[PDB]
């Protein structure tokens, strides 16, 4: 695999996410029920990053998240439609760093980044097995 080839810098996908109660409750604070939580921004970033990368990987390989960061800029209220844009920023080794911007009709609401690693599904399964096995 040549990840520089499979994932050119600047490659992007978008989606529009409507803010719903399941996207706010994850604020874990009744007082913040009106707007989208950081966890929701992260989940949506993850979804798009997987949509960009995984179908470009050969059979037996997937991506896994190893670091995420989100900056909140402004509230995305319940019923808002938030456009997420996730873009390949750089490739290094078996990792891809993607940037994220979330906007609505009134302007930017959040930014982010996510680093993902390409793994063998077989080796991933074995890692999980070994970790939770016997001493």
Please report, as ranges, the residues that interact with a copy of itself according to CB under 8 A: 26-29, 31-32, 34-35, 37-40, 42-43, 46-47, 50, 54, 62-72, 74-75, 77, 80, 106, 121, 124-125, 127-128, 131-132
Q: Give the residue carrying structure tokens 């179908």.
A: 55
The closest of 69, 97, 72 to 82, measured between CA atoms, is 72
Establish if 81 lies at the interface with Na ion (CB under 5 A).
Answer: no
Q: Which two tokens mark 82?
A: 């938030």
CA-to-CA distance for 97 and 58, rounded, in angstroms?
Answer: 19
Choice from 26, 27, 38, 85 touching Cl ion (CB under 5 A): 38
Q: Residue 30 or residue 135: which is nearer to Cl ion going by CB?
A: 135
* Binding partner of residue 87 among a copy of itself, Cl ion, Na ion, none, CB cut-off 5 to 8 Å per kind: none
Largest CA distance in the chain: 55
CA-to-CA distance for 62 and 46, rounded, in angstroms?
Answer: 13
Q: Residue 43 or residue 89: which is nearer to Na ion going by CB?
A: 43
């Amino acid at each position: 695999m040549d990840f520089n080839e499979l994932f050119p810098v600047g490659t992007y996908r978008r989606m529009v996410k409507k803010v719903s109660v399941s996207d706010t409750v994850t604020n874990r604070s009744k007082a913040l029920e009106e707007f989208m939580s950081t966890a929701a921004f992260l989940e949506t970033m993850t979804q798009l990053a997987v949509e960009i990368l995984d179908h470009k990987l050969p059979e037996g390989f997937v991506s896994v998240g190893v670091r995420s960061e989100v900056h909140n800029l402004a509230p995305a209220v319940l019923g808002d439609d938030v456009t997420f844009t996730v873009t390949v920023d750089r490739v290094e080794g078996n990792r891809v760093v993607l940037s994220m911007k979330a906007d609505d009709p009134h302007g930017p609401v959040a930014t982010g980044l996510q680093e993902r690693v390409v793994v063998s599904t077989d080796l991933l399964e074995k890692r999980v097995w070994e970790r939770f096995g016997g001493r």
